[PDB]
Design a binder for this molecule. Sequence first.
Ligand SMILES: *C[C@@]1(O)CC[C@@H](OC(=O)NC(=O)CCl)[C@@H](OC)[C@@H]1[C@@]1(C)O[C@@H]1CC=C(C)C
Ligand SMILES: [Co+2]
Ligand SMILES: [Co+2]
Length: 355
Amino acid sequence: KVQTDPPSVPICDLYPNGVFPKGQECEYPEEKKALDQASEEIWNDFREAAEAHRQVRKYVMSWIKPGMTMIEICEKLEDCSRKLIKENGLNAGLAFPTGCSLNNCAAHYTPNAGDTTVLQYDDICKIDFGTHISGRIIDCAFTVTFNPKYDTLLKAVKDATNTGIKCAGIDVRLCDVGEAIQEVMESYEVEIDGKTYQVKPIRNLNGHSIGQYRIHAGKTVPIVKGGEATRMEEGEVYAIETFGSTGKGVVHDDMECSHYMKNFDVGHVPIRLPRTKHLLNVINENFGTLAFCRRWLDRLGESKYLMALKNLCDLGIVDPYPPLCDIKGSYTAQFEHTILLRPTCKEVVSRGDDY
Ligand SMILES: *C[C@@]1(O)CC[C@@H](OC(=O)NC(=O)CCl)[C@@H](OC)[C@@H]1[C@@]1(C)O[C@@H]1CC=C(C)C
Ligand SMILES: [Co+2]
Ligand SMILES: [Co+2]
């Protein structure tokens, strides 16, 4: 039909012909048109996931406010995402947990059960969430603030992400994208609570290629100079994300872990320990190689799983991804889009009218 007041109509019911809206198509900085058309069903799956992402994040921006708990924020967002993507096992769903990392924490925080953290007026919150259709994943992220003191820091990082998106292309060196992002990000100076800062890229955070059911397909997109001259290739899909900070510009692991994901390269492992075997079956059935969090195990009715989960991490079957934070007192911001390197053009598939 038409989408409802608070979104509830699945994207596939809005586009009944099964053809979803294109993102922003860009020229790069016969045969290829045929080759582009041959993968049309893949691009269409990314576009369905991207339209869900656009409609969920517009909804989130309408209601996210200080005073809400982080758990309330993530559950309200994920509810909407499950409805709009028309969650169906591993065929359509949430690609990874909702990040809502605060202040000096830049990535990989979502609340676990019992977290009483409440969003504050002065917080800078990075909302990073993913949708997929048939394993075609959209990773797209933006920063929420309520105090205008952070506006230039957000503009710096938004400009740096758009610079990396403009620089990207077939046969472009990943190191050149990094150098370009850093030049733009470091051109910004900000003043927050009477202290001035030159905005710094977080040098040990990166964008990444994306593969089917594989949020990180192994190529990294640097956000500072000095990286690898490995080239981007036709048909690849990339999350172009940049992170800016007022602190050291380096993150370390910190706080409790919430995010986990099966190692993509680990095959079947026979397990006899009963609780560990059951938890691995739950993971394989519900997530496969997609990332999950502890709240997502709780919602499936699992309990007494933390030792089984530690066991799967210690075996190397599952990897933990703890929150990544700069120094105490620092402020970090993030913007990200997913781009498709199609044969005929570069498509910023997750681009909206918002960012
Ligand atoms: C979650 C995240 O997308 C965060 C940004 C980036 O992290 C890093 O660059 N990390 C490091 O260098 C470790 Cl010190 C992404 O990796 C390039 C990272 C991502 C894709 O690897 C995780 C896997 C995804 C989930 C746990 C959601
Ligand atoms: Co992301
Ligand atoms: Co990403």
